Each structure stands twice: as C-alpha cells, then as structure tokens.
C-alpha cells in the first residue's frame, strides 16, 4: 500500500485515540468547575467529535484552562487528520491523471 493511504489510515486510528483520550481528560479537567457541563463521558465523546470536525454547535464546551487545552489538541488532531485525507485524495488524482497522459 502506498504511503498516502497508510498515512490516512494511521491518522484515522490516531484520531479515534485522541477522541477517546480527549473525552476522558475533558471530564477530568471540567468536574470541579461550578457551572461546567462537559462532565459525563457519553456527551464528552460527542463533544470531542463535533470539536474535531470543527462543527462546534455550542451545546457543550470547556470552561477551564486544562479542558480548553484538551480541546485545542482535539481540534488540531481533527483538522490535521481530515487534511491528510484530502492530501491523500489529491495524490491519488495526480497519479491517475499522469497515467491518463501516458506518463
């Protein structure tokens, strides 16, 4: 398997790991802060997904310093992972077009 496909797969697995770890850590960081809502694991996982995809509905979000640092890691991991898939798709099209041109 070519590099871009392997890297894409790896990025997906790493993203799932970041989502799970981020969910666990977000609850750890937010409980103890009066008013915080990102405090149970099921909704924290949902929050991690809508954060990684950059949707950000606003139904849930961190209010503490550490919860926000966790959020930044989730954001960057999501953007980087989806960006890498785009890059892999571009490489695929580039390779195919070269062929179609006889190269």
């Amino acid at each position, epitope marked *: 398997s070519a590099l871009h496909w392997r890297a894409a797969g790896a990025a997906t697995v790493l993203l799932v790991i970041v989502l799970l770890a981020g969910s*666990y850590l977000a*609850v*750890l960081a*937010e*409980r*103890g*802060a*009066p*008013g*915080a*809502q990102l*405090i*149970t*694991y*099921p909704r924290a996982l949902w929050w991690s997904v809508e954060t990684a995809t950059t949707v950000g509905y606003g139904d849930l979000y961190p209010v503490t310093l550490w919860g926000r640092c966790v959020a930044v890691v989730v954001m960057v991991a999501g953007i980087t992972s989806f960006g890498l898939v785009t890059a892999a798709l571009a490489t695929w099209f580039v390779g195919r077009e070269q062929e179609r041109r006889g190269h």
Partner: antibody
Amino acid sequence: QVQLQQPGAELVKPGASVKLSCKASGYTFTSDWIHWVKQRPGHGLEWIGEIIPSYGRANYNEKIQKKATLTADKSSSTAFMQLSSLTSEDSAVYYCARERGDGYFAVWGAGTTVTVSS
Amino acid sequence: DILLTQSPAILSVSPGERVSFSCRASQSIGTDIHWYQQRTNGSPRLLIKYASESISGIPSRFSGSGSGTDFTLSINSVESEDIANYYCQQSNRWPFTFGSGTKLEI
C-alpha cells in the same frame, strides 16, 4: 454481591479525626467515580465530594466547610474519606456511592454512622 | 449551582391511587434528572434515570416524565411498600445537587 462495603459505625471525640472506608466489588471501570454523601438524622442528602480512582483526583462541595479529604487505593479497590477536627455538627450517616461517569448513583453503600461525642 | 425544589414536602394518597412527585430545577437541565427512593433506615435506591428511563428490578408502577426545569416521578396505584422519602438529583452541571425530598404518606 454487595458492591460497596462500609463499616457500621465510628465514635469520634470532639476535635479528633476519623478515616471512613468504602470497599468496592463488581465491575470496575477507569470511568468510575466514588461519591460521598452526608445525611443528618431527619434531614436530606448532602453531597460532600467525589474522587476518580483511576486518576486519583478529588473534587469537593464548595458550599460547605471542608471537613473531608478523599483518597483511593486501586490495589484494594478501596476509597477513603478522612474527616478531621469533628464537632457534633459532623455527627451523621455518611454514604459512599458509585457513579459510572454518567451522572447517576447506580449503587450506594449501607452507610457509616459517625457520632461525635466524649 | 442548580437548586432542585421538591414541593410539597409530604404527599398523602389513598391506597391504589396514582401519585405524582414534583421536582423543579432553578434553570434548564434537559433530562439530566434522576430519582431515588429511601425507606426508613435504608440507603437510597435508584428508581428512574435521565428523567424517564426504567431501571431493571424496579416495579413497572414507577415512571418519570419531564424535561427542562419541571420533572415528575409517578407511581400508578400506590401500595404500602412505596412508603418512603423520594429525592431527585441533577447531573447537568457541576456540582451534582439533590432536591430536599418528598415523603409519601398513605
């Protein structure tokens, strides 16, 4: 089988401290939190604090004077609540309860009756 | 912190009659409300979770409803064994808080 085991009672002289225990059995997850609740005779339930054994962090009710310090021993699956410098105001039943990180207390211990008297 | 108001503090019903306990939150908490039963000298016992979800082992007689700020715990056809104190508890915001409790009298 009993998921949370707590000693029946503890007599404490005013000013002294005591360490309550809560031995847990059954399924255990990294997402479990052990809570402590205080209930004076004839009164309601008051949340004291919580601790996550897998990490060891504890949080406390800010609305009340802090009398407790929570710890947990992973190898013995036991959670502890150290109550210090007690007065008769601290006399009550202290329950421990388990929450699977999803907001509700799935199960409660039988409670430890603490009496502060000379 | 979220204040949970349970009024009336005492509810008197006749045998076999349907009864409804009230729980009002100081602010909207979605369906993050749970109900517990505590008999004389007993420890609290979970009856309903997330406002209306059944717990295995609890008689079908028990049911819950509501969302937002107003919640209800209902018992269809009350019987002696239901005599106890009932408490609501929220988990929408930190810290978790308890209502002051309602006693069922027959």
